[PDB]
């Protein structure tokens with residue numbers, strides 16, 4: 001199927017498919033079962049920020065999630081993306097809900113990639129009704145307050161369960177190329193995860209996939225709209 | 232048909248369709264008959280550089296073409312692109328040949344656009360065999376020495392007449408949006424125009440069009456792959 | 463004395479020294495008597511934004527001042543800065559008060575300059591207690607809420623009259639150099655002008671000066687901390 | 694004395710002060726005795742490129758040196774710069790010669806730093822006769838062919854032994870600040886190390902120091918103009 005490398009912000013622990021007993025951030029390499037995780041003290045109702053970075057020198061993929069005036073969670077995983085992903089990929093954001101729900105509102109998102117001396121950079125400090133440079137999939141919608149809502153949110157502002165949505169940047173990104181000395185990318189997005197129930201689910205993720213990636217069927221809930229199964 | 236705003240580097244004067252009696256650079260607003268031109272001392276065989284810029288404050292579109300150790304040609308034209316182009320556009324390079332020919336080799340190309348924020352930036356300091364973020368049209372080919380050849384070039388390196396090709400960046404660009412204080416873009420490309428014959432033709436152009444723009448039929452020669460007619 | 467090119471946001475009209483009968487923005491070229499002005503509907507108590515831009519192609523200096531949900535004021539003036547300013551300059555913000563006062567709080571400030579390719583860029587989305595890359599002059603202070611206060615503000619938050627202060631970026635900026643095809647800069651700052659009295663004064667200005675520029679004596683009030691006299 | 698963090702490109706091995714038996718690149722943390730080194734196949738007469746990077750997420754300082762069509766050398770070292778360097782620093786390039794010599798020509802140099810936001814970026818694709826934003830120390834000179842010569846070179850283009858020179862960017866750089874989630878910098882320079890003799894010396898280095906750093910006395914040769922001794 002698709003080849004997926006993602007940084008997940010997993011709000012709901014699915015101990016049955018290998019998740020730790022608490023909300024966590026993790027690094028997924030072609031599997032929803034994080035290669036590396038870290039505890040994450042999710043703050044329902046507050047706007048968070050996630051910074052992801054990778055560079056060909058270290059070949060280490062790192063992420064840092066933080067809320068203002070609170071400690072951050074950080075997770076890093078050694079991975080050579082040339083052996084994982086194909087040269088050209090698409091980058092995006094994904095999110096799901098299941099029995100439990102939460103809003104998966106993205107307030108902004110940026111990305112920069114350099115293959116050294118080619119570069120790509122985009123920034124969305126706001127989202128429009130018809131964001132033509134975003135390929136929306138699933139329940140994802142834009143213009144919803146100038147925000148990007150990855151999963152279903154009803155008029156009253158409430159999140160719906162069993163929802164899945166993604167947003168991919170329109171242009172393919174040349175993630176690697178052997179003749180390059182330094183290949184690198186970084187991404188950043190602010191989000192607003194808010195759930196009326198005691199247990200929010202399921203999470204948000206930044207991912208890099210094959211250019212023709214699409215939401216696997218049934219990947220609501222714990223699969224975060226990324227994987228076809230829990231393998 | 233398409234809505235075209237372009238900066239042309241016209242190597243061959245077509246006095247019959249309004250061109251001055253010498254190679255020139257010009258500003259085309261929905262017409263191949265430049266709204267404003269400037270004499271251009273084209274240097275056959277040498278790599279040139281073109282810088283184009285527009286900003287919503289001045290609403291002036293300027294371009295500057297130069298060769299090392301030589302003077303530069305400059306042309307500017309007052310235009311409010313909100314009344315000319317649609318909000319979302321695609322940006323690209325185009326080129327043609329006719330009876331007379333020349334190579335229309337692009338060695339690099341970059342573009343940056345900002346709608347104040349929201350930004351887009353790309354840089355091609357080299358072109359690969361399959362540049363997936365470029366939509367090639369006509370005789371345009373990549374990987375041809377790490378270069379982008381807009382028009383036909385045979386094995387021996389010779390240009391072919393009656394050729395037309397374009398290259399558009401894959402993602403749509405939000406060129407304007409009323410709620411913005413400052414909308415602006417700039418582009419830069421280096422090129423290599425070389426022709427074995429005494430009179431090279433026909434030229435190169437940076438253009439901004441409707442997202443679904445394609446080479447008008449028969450637009451080889453003097454139409455620079457931009458316009459359906461000489462109106 | 464000093465060579466000054468500035469974009470002023472004049473909150474108090476000094477009809478005696480050539481000011482129009484209303485708050486206005488203007489372009490000052492070695493004179494406090496604006497070469498070009500434009501009416502400005504200053505909003506006491508609200509955070510404004512100013513965008514300034516210049517490029518060697520047009521040789522036009524433009525500025526745009528705006529408040530959210532309000533129309534903007536724009537002023538442009540044709541000027542070849544190579545004949546006005548020296549190659550190397552320093553850039554900064556300045557402000558004053560006289561009989562009447564107002565807070566001249568700068569909340570952020572950025573600048574980018576390119577001589578093409580050499581470039582300089584800095585951004586202050588916040589100011590620290592000891593901002594070592596800023597040369598503060600006069601009553602200017604930093605750390606004052608993470609903000610830069612150009613003129614005196616007392617504990618209770620009230621502005622003091624007869625105050626003058628400036629803030630210059632530490633490094634000299636190569637504003638021009640004949641061997642360059644395109645020389646250009648742009649600057650942006652957000653401010654908070656608030657005055658308890660019915661008539662706020664005197665204004666804020668972005669300026670470019672000789673590297674060793676300092677506040678002329680007595681330049682409080684209408685001289686905006688830029689000029690030694692009203693000539 | 695000064696606090697120094699540098700990435701050295703050591704062309705001459707000093708086995709007596711802890712150097713491996715071959716030219717190497719290394720990471721120096723307040724000591725000329727590299728915390729981590731890597732073999733470097735220096736190419737006399739060819740222009741090389743060095744990329745250095747650090748980010749607060751990984752807290753790993755990496756460097757990659759490469760010559761076209763040749764393998765690159767890479768060295769990384771885990772270090773938390775908040776415990777090593779002071780908040781505000783100056784960044785620069787340094788170089789020396791001793792009994793043996795070589796040219797230490799820098800053809801270009803760029804640097805970018807971000808504390809998140811707040812940012813600093815500069816680029817020198819060429820150096821002028823009087824580069825006012827560069828603080829030159831020792832035998833360092835600019836305008837020397839549009840290049841920056843860190844150590845003595847004589848009209849005929851020959852390098853002189855026992856030479857030492859540095860070039861620091863004029864403005865202080867806010868390297869760290871506790872209230873920041875992500876602090877990071879990167880630097881890049883191309884160089885031309887050419888020596889007429891059989892055993893070139895001594896090397897070039899990118900360094901970060903206390904703002905008031907200056908070449909320690911006698912630091913020619915193996916001390917690379919960075920350290921007062923070999924401890």
Ligand SMILES: CO[C@H]1O[C@H](CO[C@H]2O[C@H](CO)[C@@H](O)[C@H](O)[C@@H]2O)[C@@H](O)[C@H](O[C@H]2O[C@H](CO)[C@@H](O)[C@H](O)[C@@H]2O)[C@@H]1O
Pocket residue numbers: 012013014015016017097098099100101201202220221222223
């Ligand atoms: C029958 O229980 C199984 O399904 C429960 C609901 O599953 C769906 O809803 C959850 C939350 O909205 C979502 O994450 C899933 O992907 C589905 O969309 C689920 O709650 C339950 O898990 C619970 O029990 C297991 C062990 O059985 C634990 O590992 C979990 O952490 C929960 O305690 C299970 O999947």
Ligand SMILES: CO[C@H]1O[C@H](CO[C@H]2O[C@H](CO)[C@@H](O)[C@H](O)[C@@H]2O)[C@@H](O)[C@H](O[C@H]2O[C@H](CO)[C@@H](O)[C@H](O)[C@@H]2O)[C@@H]1O
Pocket residue numbers: 243244245246247248328329330331332432433451452453454
């Ligand atoms: C018979 O001459 C007419 O056609 C000539 C060839 O035209 C083709 O080639 C040119 C150049 O490659 C291309 O631009 C055209 O679109 C065709 O593909 C052409 O050379 C010629 O132009 C010249 O003659 C007219 C009339 O004097 C002048 O106005 C021009 O300046 C040229 O001198 C003409 O169109």
Ligand SMILES: CO[C@H]1O[C@H](CO[C@H]2O[C@H](CO)[C@@H](O)[C@H](O)[C@@H]2O)[C@@H](O)[C@H](O[C@H]2O[C@H](CO)[C@@H](O)[C@H](O)[C@@H]2O)[C@@H]1O
Pocket residue numbers: 474475476477478479559560561562563663664682683684685
């Ligand atoms: C009539 O008094 C003169 O001086 C007044 C005080 O000037 C000082 O304070 C103002 C306001 O802060 C400042 O701009 C000056 O530089 C001094 O620091 C001044 O208020 C007054 O100006 C007003 O009156 C004249 C004539 O009526 C008008 O031309 C102006 O527009 C003002 O209405 C005057 O210069």
Ligand SMILES: CO[C@H]1O[C@H](CO[C@H]2O[C@H](CO)[C@@H](O)[C@H](O)[C@@H]2O)[C@@H](O)[C@H](O[C@H]2O[C@H](CO)[C@@H](O)[C@H](O)[C@@H]2O)[C@@H]1O
Pocket residue numbers: 705706707708709710790791792793794894895913914915916
């Ligand atoms: C007297 O020998 C000692 O100094 C020699 C010269 O030192 C000067 O020159 C070198 C290179 O230009 C420079 O790095 C020094 O700082 C001085 O400027 C030096 O050659 C010699 O070293 C010898 O021993 C070491 C063993 O570690 C070898 O690596 C060297 O190649 C020499 O064999 C010594 O320090």
Ligand SMILES: [Ca+2]
Pocket residue numbers: 010011012013014019202222
């Ligand atoms: Ca889960």
Ligand SMILES: [Ca+2]
Pocket residue numbers: 241242243244245250433434453
């Ligand atoms: Ca023509």
Ligand SMILES: [Ca+2]
Pocket residue numbers: 472473474475476481664684
């Ligand atoms: Ca005034």
Ligand SMILES: [Ca+2]
Pocket residue numbers: 703704705706707712895915
């Ligand atoms: Ca050595």
Ligand SMILES: [Mn+2]
Pocket residue numbers: 008010019020026032034
């Ligand atoms: Mn998980």
Ligand SMILES: [Mn+2]
Pocket residue numbers: 239241250255257263265
């Ligand atoms: Mn023409």
Ligand SMILES: [Mn+2]
Pocket residue numbers: 470472481482488494496
């Ligand atoms: Mn005025």
Ligand SMILES: [Mn+2]
Pocket residue numbers: 701703712717719725727
């Ligand atoms: Mn060493």
